[PDB]
Design a protein around this ligand. Sequence first.
Ligand code: SAH
Length: 225
Amino acid sequence: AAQRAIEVRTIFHMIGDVSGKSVLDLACGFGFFGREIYRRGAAKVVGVDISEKMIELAREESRKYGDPLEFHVRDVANMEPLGQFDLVNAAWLFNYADSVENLRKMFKVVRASLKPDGKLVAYTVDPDFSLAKGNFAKYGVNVLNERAWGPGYRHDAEFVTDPPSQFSFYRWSRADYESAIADAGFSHFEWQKPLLEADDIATHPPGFWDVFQNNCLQTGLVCKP
Ligand SMILES: Nc1ncnc2c1ncn2[C@@H]1O[C@H](CSCC[C@H](N)C(=O)O)[C@@H](O)[C@H]1O
């Protein structure tokens, strides 16, 4: 999966120095980002996922490496309050909101989870992605279709793995994201193009990254109270 290196680089560029910070890792899966955030010096990391199966995995991972991550099974859109943190990290949370209403609830939960000087770092589907402009299979995500779903779009996809793992997500428009951000009470936000570097260009055949730059499936997003 060639895209994961760039995603990790972009996320940690947005996060910056985590030393001594408290961190809430939303849609945490098995804990990849929260666990690495801790490795780089975070004071405290809490992970939340809606899947009991994923949290069971995430807890076994922390047992294997002996790290102090704490995990919770919760639906972020309807989340029991969990305190306030210096940093909320949300890699692949918002594209699982199945309605604009649910996207807006998620941004409100995030804002309630933030200290006044805190920040949200998020990775999500670029609203401008258009399936016709090029698939993302060569970067690790095979987008199979694109269907209108209310004011947004539904995509069925699969990770280019063995076996290829199927999943489904939602692409909400930039205007709906920015409305959810503003109405949740974030005074500032910035979209972050993924940090494709000269080193990436040099280590791949010419033009390998053209579709990635012309029709990126991913985007970063940083919001501050
Ligand atoms: N409403 C919701 N609340 C919390 N977690 C959710 C959710 N909808 C989907 N998820 C979780 O979000 C995850 C997306 S996969 C991303 C996992 C991890 N952040 C990583 O980057 O590796 C899945 O584990 C899924 O269970």
